[PDB]
Design a protein around this ligand. Structure first.
Ligand code: ZN
Lengths: 193, 424, 92, 190, 61, 568
């Protein structure tokens, strides 16, 4: 069959990765492609090409994440840390979480995956002590998982409202939640005449 | 009394460490490290594509370094040794020692793609060629800094008696032109903490750095931490320094109104409309060997009353009127300089024409916000003056429409007369 | 197959043969540009270093040739050698 | 004194919450999982503790009897912090160790090893049956009726003889109902 | 359920993919004949990713 | 001369200009396995090319014949060949029988060019003058040795080549004698190939902490044999360490915190990963000083530990589990009484990598573990092929070990090193008690026929380890003059003795007027001359010519010619 079973009703972490890389990101080029008014060109299709042919050294700009990672694999690019990825921001989110146990924080839908990617291949850029950032991310993960369990306590046929749950967590919990809801609905419907 | 010390743009002292940045700029940064007497000089280029990193050990202990795409100008003040190292490497690192009289200490070194410049504590300006062939020696007011961008050389002539002075000149391959000569430089010297003094020991003048603009307008950042740009530098008659940033105010702004201290903008180079500089959030105003990622901040006309913002806040809120005025002034000055450069030096990138067009648009629309503000005040005369400055007649249609929406028939009539006059 | 017959019933064997024919029909023609039989794993890595798990001699490539020599390592773009990896010749 | 004990507890808490290899807080995750299966107990590798900071390991070796309870208290606090939302109970956690260092033959053991963390091996000859050990006690004072309790550890105490709010030589008594106990086996090794 | 196959989208995408691959081959021929390959690598990866997405969708349906 | 140090960057740029094409890989890197520094150099080059994103291939090799056959199967598409630690002295053009005309293309014009490019990094010393001068397809990254020592050799070579009769004789014989004098001299590695590659990276500005660590490892591995080279290079590596050292000092230890700091690297064995007692018990220098091989040496070792005031029990405890007090005061302990026992030379400051909380490792211990992994990582011609296949697998295993992620492999290598070291020690003590060493007056022959450890000794590096330990003990033994040392090991499966010719060496600490002179190794030349004279089957294919094989019955006749040989 054209699709493996494990892919039948969800996305593996790799697909989540890919969809994340589809996003853009601040970067500081170490090259100046922009040709002076006084040559190989990108000419992409799925993303912008205007910026790429206008790279200027040490000039912030946006590029799709995967291109940024490709360059970062080379010494020719530097990945700018997203603002939300900052000790101040993480601490604020943690405090909000503790303040509102019922609700989740408004982290970027792709915060976990993005943080992991940057940590793996962008340790240099991170201004703050990388270890502290990893620890705070882990703490956020723990808190969100606890709140996930608390919400699960109230699993019901009618509906669910995850709100600010991150995409990675959503993919993680998709099978269990969906199946449980399906069985509960089946039971209740069977009860219906 | 004042002490004359070697200086390089955006340089950093050794401090307690054994390694310091000899200098840094858009092209790159060169940092040296003590190594068993012999010093290890490392030359780092920002643009990896343009050039290649290389590190050499300096027995002379050169403290003065100048960086430019063509090469580097390493020199030791106490010895008078000056060594040039062409980046291309096609040509050997020609080297020579200048005549240093008793107490004559090299204040700074300037590199020109064709000529070479050396400044001394005694003000003995010295000119050598790209291969080191001497050109001439001149006595002038002691030069503390020797910024040199392309063929434009900007020098800071200071003396205990002549005071603060600067000379702007573009030697060029020929037709050497002196835009200004030791004119008084309107900058504020530091007040006379331990790190601050040590930097002053490492930088008596307190110049955070010195460089030209992206397009090549002279840029200065004194201990006041205010970036001053010489508006109309190409024309001495209208030449004037304009404070395009007051780093302290901007930091207090982005800090959420908080009076942060550790933050220290380390001026690196001024991009157009944006300053490339490192925010050293530490006791040492200068950065550390593991140089962090340079930060970019847009220029800001300093017209924010901190009291107004504090009253608003009690994330900083800015009145739409005071904001609009600031954007008005910023766009005005930016368009001025942009047009000057475009007509005087063309454009290295064609986008500048469209940038200036959009800037004129933003200028007119800022006049329009302030026009609406005046109309709400019923100051139809002030609003009329505002519309008078309006550059675009289509924006003038917008303005007359605003006056109609502001219920100012006298205003509307005035702006209609303005429509006709501009049509004339 | 797109890339134990005894266990299969002759009807099952015929059906499997027909299914292979159908798949090759699909990948041939419109949509040929993409290789439906290709891996469903996203191509995260542009370049991958590979050690030949089993020596099989030199092999051809669109613009090159790979010499498969036991305990020899290659640094080549993943896409080019993905089929060989699926064939088990190449490691990592 | 109590400040130094709190400092040691904080150090162990930091070790648990910070000790990371590659990109995984192995001990944080292990604790979270063990809680998730209600197995309120943690296993720690000695080498890891040394790597985090030799000082804590050495202090543990010096006075295991007292250091270990503090470490278990730290484990309990970390478990509460990671498993129960703050400003929104768990039992004392068992701490498990693995030195993997040089062994000491059973015969060689002597006074020298007293109170020292020993590492050895053998064959278990027999196993006793589990008995009760009072982790926590509920205590009534016999005459003035003053309530109280004791939290005892299985290392290195007796019912207080003083009234603490003459009342008597040992007016305190155990209330088995409110008290809490654990299991304790006895094994013999050759 | 199976969603209505957005014919036009895939038609245009496949046309773009075909022409992109062809012009990439042209650049390859030129290389065989600045010369920085970084944009070439970006092309190769972009085509790989797009083809992967299309293949995933096709196999799923 | 052919490619001097200054022009390494230019040669690298040429290599790029030739083989740089994403379309296909035109760069092949032949590497001779069984050489730590060679492996480090190859890894450094691999990383460099990875940065340059130039597709290439790695070819482990064990013997010259293997290299020949591999070149035979080469494809014309490949234009760049990198030879790591092999071929420097041989006439590769002759050995590979490369015809310039076969590869000549685009010669024009006073210019020349060829379709392929053979780059050689084999820094032994006796450079093949034809390779240096005669060949152009051959490229040799020379350390300047030619331009500093072979200038007269260059003149003589160019004169002889120029000659194409009393005057003819009066010149040709002197030039031939000059060339022969440059020949007939034993091989002796000149400098770390890793050092050359690190210098090249510095030229390309690619230097980073990892590259410096790799160079350190290569040089440290080279140390044991050519200690003088390690001494010469040590200041440079220390300089680079300081250069790349971060500004932050005493930064709080964190998992991400990684440092490469210089501090006392006591000249012992697996100190950090073995009990102090064991480390001393197997430190070649220690045994040589105290003759630990004899039981009286063990008694003296106990006496020394008592003098240290260290409980022996503690000395046998795992190093990671030492008491903090001893673990820190060991510096003073060594400062005291080391001279009393004459072991003061053990004290040595050296590079010591560390990372996060996982622990620390000395470059010496790291290279030791790497060698152990290289050695024990896992129809007669087929048997030899399978053995060399195991060696190649160990080579790739060490390559993997180089990565930090695979700390498990490094630990496995550490345990293997411990086991091999103890086995070597036991075999050496048994040999010395057996008095198998025979004073032949041309060498101290010691043939091996005992079963145990013989299987291990089939590996050339294992035999080298045993012989190195023996040579340490002998050199420390002042009674023994620096006689050439001969080792042979019969392989029952092949019924061949693994003959190894091991040069002598002045005491490690020895650094007087003598010891300065390098005792070149004529074992290889003597073996080759005897083999040519005789017909006893042997295998000079091994890149390390000093190591050769011979039939169980061809040994003693070959040994008889060897003692008869005057070349030694
Ligand atoms: Zn009482």
């Amino acid at each position: 069959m054209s699709l493996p079973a494990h892919l039948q009703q969800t996305f593996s972490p790799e697909e989540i990765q890919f969809i994340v890389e589809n996003e853009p990101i601040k970067i500081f080029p170490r090259i100046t492609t922009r040709q002076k008014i006084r040559h190989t060109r990108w000419q992409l299709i799925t993303t912008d090409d205007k910026a790429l042919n206008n790279m200027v050294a040490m000039r912030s700009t946006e590029v799709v994440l995967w291109i940024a990672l490709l360059l970062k694999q080379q010494s020719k690019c530097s990945i700018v840390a997203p603002q939300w990825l900052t000790t101040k921001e993480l601490d604020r989110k943690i405090q909000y979480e503790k303040t509102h146990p019922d609700r989740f924080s408004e982290l970027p839908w792709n915060w976990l995956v993005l943080a992991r990617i940057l940590f793996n291949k962008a340790k240099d850029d991170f201004h703050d002590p990388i270890h502290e950032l990893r620890g705070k991310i882990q703490d956020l993960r723990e808190i969100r998982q606890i709140k996930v369990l608390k919400g699960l306590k109230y699993l019901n046929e009618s509906h669910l409202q995850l709100d600010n749950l991150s995409l990675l967590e959503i993919n993680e919990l998709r099978p269990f939640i969906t199946e449980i809801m399906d069985k509960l609905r089946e039971i209740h419907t069977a009860s219906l005449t | 009394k004042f002490r004359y010390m070697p200086f390089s743009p955006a340089g950093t002292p050794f401090g307690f460490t054994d390694r310091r940045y000899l200098t840094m700029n858009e092209v790159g940064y060169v940092s040296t490290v003590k190594n068993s007497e012999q010093y290890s000089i490392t030359v780092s280029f920002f643009d990896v594509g343009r050039f290649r990193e290389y590190h050499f050990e300096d027995l002379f202990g050169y403290d003065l370094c100048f960086l430019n795409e063509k090469g580097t100008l390493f020199g030791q003040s106490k010895t008078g040794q000056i060594q040039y190292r062409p980046h291309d490497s096609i040509h050997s690192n020609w080297t020579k020692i200048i005549p240093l009289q008793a107490g004559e200490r090299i204040t700074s070194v300037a590199a020109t793609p064709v000529r070479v410049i050396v400044g001394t504590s005694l003000g003995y300006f010295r000119s050598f060629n790209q291969f080191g062939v001497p050109f001439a020696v001149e006595k002038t007011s002691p030069i503390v800094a020797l910024t040199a961008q392309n063929y434009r050389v900007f020098s800071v002539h200071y003396s205990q008696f002549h005071g603060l002075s600067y000379s702007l000149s573009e030697l060029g391959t020929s037709s050497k032109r002196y835009y200004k000569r030791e004119c008084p430089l309107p900058m504020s010297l530091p007040n006379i903490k331990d790190a601050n003094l040590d930097y002053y020991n490492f930088n008596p003048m307190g110049i955070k750095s010195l460089f030209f603009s992206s397009y090549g307008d002279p840029c200065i950042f004194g201990s006041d931490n205010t970036l001053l740009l010489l508006s109309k530098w190409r024309s001495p008659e209208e030449s004037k320094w304009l404070p395009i940033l007051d780093s302290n105010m901007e930091i207090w702004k982005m800090s959420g109104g908080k009076e942060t201290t550790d933050i220290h903008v380390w001026p690196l180079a001024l991009a157009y409309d944006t300053l490339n500089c490192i925010l050293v959030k530490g006791k040492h105003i200068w950065p550390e060997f593991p140089l962090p990622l340079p930060s970019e901040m847009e220029i800001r006309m300093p017209v924010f009353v901190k009291s107004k913002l504090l009253e608003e806040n009690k994330e900083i809120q800015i009145p739409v009127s005071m904001a609009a005025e600031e954007e008005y002034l910023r766009s005005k000055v930016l368009s001025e300089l942009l047009t000057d450069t475009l007509e005087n030096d063309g454009e290295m990138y064609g986008n500048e024409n469209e940038v200036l067009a959009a800037l004129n648009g933003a200028y007119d629309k800022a006049l329009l916000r302030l026009f609406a503000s005046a109309c709400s005040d019923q100051n139809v005369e002030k609003a009329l003056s505002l519309a008078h400055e309006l550059k675009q007649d289509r924006a003038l249609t917008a303005a007359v429409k605003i006056s109609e929406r502001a219920e100012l028939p006298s205003l509307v009539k005035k702006i209609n007369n303005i429509r006709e006059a501009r049509y004339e | 197959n797109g890339l134990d017959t005894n266990n299969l019933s002759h009807q099952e064997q015929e059906y499997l043969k027909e299914y292979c024919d159908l798949i090759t029909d699909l990948k041939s023609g419109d949509l040929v540009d993409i290789d439906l039989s290709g891996s469903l794993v996203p191509p995260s890595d542009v370049f991958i270093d590979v050690r030949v798990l089993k020596d099989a001699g030199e092999i051809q490539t669109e613009y090159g040739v790979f010499n498969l020599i036991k305990d020899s390592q290659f640094f080549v773009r993943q896409s080019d050698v993905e089929r060989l990896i699926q064939q088990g010749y190449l490691q990592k | 004194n109590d400040d130094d004990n709190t400092e040691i507890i904080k150090s162990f808490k930091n070790f648990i919450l910070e000790f990371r290899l590659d990109s995984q807080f192995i001990y944080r995750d292990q604790l979270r999982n063990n809680i998730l299966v209600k197995n309120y107990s943690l296993t720690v590798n000695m080498e890891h503790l040394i790597g985090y900071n030799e000082d804590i390991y050495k202090k543990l070796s010096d006075e295991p009897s007292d250091i270990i309870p503090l470490f278990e208290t730290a484990i309990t606090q970390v478990a509460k912090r990671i498993s129960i939302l703050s400003r929104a109970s768990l039992p004392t956690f068992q701490l498990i160790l693995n030195s993997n260092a040089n062994q000491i033959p059973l015969r060689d053991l002597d006074s020298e090893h007293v109170s020292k963390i020993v590492r050895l091996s053998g064959i278990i000859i027999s196993t006793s049956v589990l008995s009760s050990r009072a982790t926590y006690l509920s205590i009534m004072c016999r005459n003035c009726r003053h309530t109280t309790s004791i939290t005892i550890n299985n290392f290195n105490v007796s019912l207080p003889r003083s009234c603490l709010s003459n009342c008597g030589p040992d007016p305190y008594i155990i209330i088995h109902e409110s008290s809490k106990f654990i299991d304790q086996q006895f094994l013999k090794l050759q | 359920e199976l969603l209505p196959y957005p014919h036009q989208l895939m038609k245009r995408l496949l046309n773009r993919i075909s022409m992109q691959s062809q012009l990439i081959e042209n650049i390859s021929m030129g290389f065989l004949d600045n010369e920085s390959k970084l944009p070439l690598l970006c092309m190769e990866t972009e085509l790989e990713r797009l083809k992967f997405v299309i293949r995933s969708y096709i196999r799923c349906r | 001369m052919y490619y001097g140090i200054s022009q390494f960057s230019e040669a690298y740029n040429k290599i790029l200009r030739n083989s740089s094409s994403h379309s296909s890989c035109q760069l092949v890197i032949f590497v001779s396995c069984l050489n730590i520094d060679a492996l480090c150099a190859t890894k450094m080059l691999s990383l460099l090319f990875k940065k340059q994103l130039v597709q290439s291939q790695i070819v482990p090799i064990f013997g010259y014949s293997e290299l020949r056959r591999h070149y035979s199967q080469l494809d014309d598409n490949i234009n760049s060949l990198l030879l790591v630690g092999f071929g420097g002295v041989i006439d590769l053009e002759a050995f590979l029988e490369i015809d310039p005309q076969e590869y000549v293309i685009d010669t024009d014009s006073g210019e020349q060019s060829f379709r392929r490019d053979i780059y050689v990094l084999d820094a032994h010393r006796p450079w093949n003058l034809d390779n240096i001068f005669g060949s152009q397809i051959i490229q040799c990254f020379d350390d300047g040795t030619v331009d500093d020592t072979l200038g007269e050799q260059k003149e003589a070579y160019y004169k002889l080549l120029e000659l194409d009769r009393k005057q003819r004789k009066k010149q040709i014989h002197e030039y031939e004698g000059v060339l022969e004098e440059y020949y007939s001299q034993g091989t002796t590695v000149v400098n770390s190939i890793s050092a050359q590659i690190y210098s090249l990276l510095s030229a390309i500005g690619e230097t980073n902490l990892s590259n410096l660590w790799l160079n350190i490892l290569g040089t440290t591995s080279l140390d044991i044999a050519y200690a003088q080279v390690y001494n010469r290079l040590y200041p440079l590596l220390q300089d680079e360490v300081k250069r790349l050292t971060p500004s932050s000092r005493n930064s709080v230890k964190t998992p991400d915190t990684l440092t490469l700091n210089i501090q006392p690297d006591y000249y012992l064995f697996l100190l950090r990963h073995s009990s102090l007692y064991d480390s001393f018990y197997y430190s070649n220098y220690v045994n040589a000083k105290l003759s630990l091989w004899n039981e009286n040496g063990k008694k003296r070792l106990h006496k020394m530990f008592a003098r240290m005031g260290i409980p022996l029990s503690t000395a046998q405890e795992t190093w990671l589990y030492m008491d903090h007090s001893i673990k820190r005061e060991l510096g003073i302990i060594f400062d005291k009484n080391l001279d009393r026992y004459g072991l003061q030379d053990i004290i040595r400051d050296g590079f010591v990598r560390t990372l996060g909380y996982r622990g620390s490792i000395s470059a010496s211990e790291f290279v030791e573990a790497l060698t152990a992994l290289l050695e024990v990582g896992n129809n007669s011609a087929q048997k030899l092929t399978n053995l060399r296949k195991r060696w190649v697998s160990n080579f790739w295993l060490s390559w993997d070990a180089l990565d930090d992620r695979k700390v498990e492999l490094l630990n496995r290598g550490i345990q293997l090193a411990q086991d091999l070291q103890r086995a070597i020690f036991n075999t050496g003590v048994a040999i010395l008690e057996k008095k198998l060493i025979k004073h032949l007056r041309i060498y101290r022959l010691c043939v091996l026929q005992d079963g145990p450890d013989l299987d291990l000794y089939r590996n050339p590096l294992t035999l080298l380890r045993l012989g190195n330990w023996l040579i340490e003990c002998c050199a420390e033994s002042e009674d023994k003059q620096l006689l050439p040392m001969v080792l042979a090991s019969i392989d029952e499966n092949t019924d061949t003795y693994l003959v190894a010719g091991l040069t002598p060496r002045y005491p490690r600490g020895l650094d007087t007027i003598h010891t300065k002179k390098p005792i070149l190794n004529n074992f290889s030349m003597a073996f080759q001359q005897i083999t040519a004279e005789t017909d006893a089957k042997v295998r000079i294919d091994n890149f390390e010519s000093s190591i050769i094989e011979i039939r169980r019955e061809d040994l003693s006749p070959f040994l008889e010619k060897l003692t008869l040989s005057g070349l030694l």
